[PDB]
Design a binder for this molecule. Structure first.
Ligand SMILES: COc1cc(OCC2CCCCC2)ccc1C(N)=O
Lengths: 195, 198
C-alpha cells in the first residue's frame, strides 16, 4: 500500500528520488529545515522510497494506534549522520546497535534541524557536505529518559511489560526523542546541505 | 492474518495456550525436545499467541521470501532463558540489546540453537527457585547465512564492495550449523514455551 506521492519504481522496491525545487513537496520539507537552519545551504532533498521499511513501519504504526487507542503517535523529527552511514540508513533504517547515550541506548532524533546540524551528528565530508534525515518517528506515549535504558520504562512498575513508546529529555518541552526498536522510525527525506 | 487454529482471544492481543499431551501439536514439540534432552521431563508446553509479534514477523518473512526468491528462510530453533525474561519475551520477543555474550561468540545478537540440549544448559535455561527451566521453540528467519565473527553487530555483507546487501543471519559452521544469531527485531517469533525439570 505505497503512498500516493511516491513516484513509480518500475516494479522495484527501493529508490532515492531527488525532489524538484519549488514544488509543494520540496517547499514543505525545505521549510521544516529552514525554520531553524536558514543560514545553511541546501544542495538537494531526496525522497526515500523503501517499500519494505515503509511496510514494517506502517505495521508498527497500526499496532501503536490500537494499543494507545488514538492516532497522534507520530512526529516528524531530524537525524544528522555521517556520509558513511547514509547507504545503510536508506536501505535498513535506524539501528540502535550502530556520541553520548545520556537518555538511553536507542536511536536519537531532534525536534529542531539546528540540533541535528551540529558537526558531531551531520559530520561534514571532505567537501563540507552534511547529511540530515527528516524522519517519521512513532514517539507514542513518552516519558523522561535516563542513562543506560535499553527499552523505555514501564508506564507502571505493577505491569513491567506495558512500556512507554519512547523517551525524551523533557516531557513538557521535548527537544529529542529516543526509540529502542527497529521499524519505529521511517527515514522519509535526506537533506544534503552545507554550513 | 492470525492463524485459524489459534484459540479465539475475544479481541485480546495476547494469550498463552496450554497444549494437551497426545495432540500432534504437543507431541511434535516433545519429540523435537526429547531427541537431545531425554534426561529432562516436560512440565507443560504453551502455544504463544502474540498478535503483534506475529504480524511483524510475518511481514519480515514475506520480505525475506521475496528478496531471496525462495521459501527456505525459516527454521524452528530453541532458545533457553531465565524465568525473569519470560514475561518480556512472551510480550515483546527477542531483544538483542538484552542478550548475553555467548561462551563462543559469533556476533552480538540473539542466539538460537538447533539442538534443545544446547538451550537446556543451566547457563541459558537457568533453573528458577522451583527448579523449573524454560525454553522457547522459535520460528527464526535464518535466510542466507555465513559463519559469524565476535565483532558483528549486524550480519556481514555478502560482497565487500556492496556493504549494505547483507546475509540474513550467521552461524557457527555453514556445513554443520548448530547455532544461529539474528541481529534485527521481529526476525524470530516465540511460538512455544516449554517448562521442564530434571
Ligand atoms: C546521536 O545523534 C543525536 C543525538 C541527539 O541528542 C543526543 C544528546 C542531546 C543532549 C544530551 C545528551 C545526548 C540529538 C540528535 C542526534 C542526531 N543524530 O541528529
Amino acid at each position: 500500500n505505497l503512498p500516493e506521492h511516491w513516484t513509480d519504481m518500475n516494479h522495484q522496491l527501493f529508490c532515492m528520488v531527488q525532489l524538484e525545487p519549488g514544488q509543494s513537496e520540496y517547499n514543505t520539507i525545505k521549510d521544516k529545515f529552514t525554520r531553524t537552519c536558514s543560514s545553511y545551504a541546501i544542495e538537494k532533498i531526496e525522497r526515500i522510497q523503501n517499500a519494505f521499511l515503509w511496510q514494517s513501519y506502517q505495521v508498527k504504526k497500526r499496532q501503536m494506534d490500537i494499543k494507545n487507542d488514538h492516532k497522534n503517535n507520530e512526529r516528524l523529527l531530524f537525524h544528522g549522520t555521517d556520509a558513511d552511514s547514509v547507504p545503510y540508513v536508506n536501505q535498513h533504517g535506524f539501528n540502535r546497535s550502530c556520541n553520548a547515550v545520556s537518555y538511553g541506548k536507542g536511536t536519537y532524533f531532534a525536534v529542531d534541524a539546528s540540533y541535528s546540524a551540529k558537526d558531531t551528528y551531520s559530520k561534514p565530508d571532505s567537501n563540507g557536505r552534511k547529511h540530515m534525515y527528516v524522519v517519521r518517528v512513532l514517539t507514542g506515549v513518552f516519558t523522561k529518559g535516563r542513562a543506560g535504558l535499553v527499552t523505555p520504562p514501564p508506564k507502571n512498575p505493577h505491569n513491567p511489560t506495558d512500556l512507554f513508546d519512547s523517551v525524551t529529555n523533557n516531557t513538557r518541552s521535548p527537544k529529542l526523542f529516543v526509540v529502542f526498536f527497529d521499524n519505529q522510525a521511517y527515514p522519509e527525506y535526506l537533506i544534503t546541505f552545507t554550513a
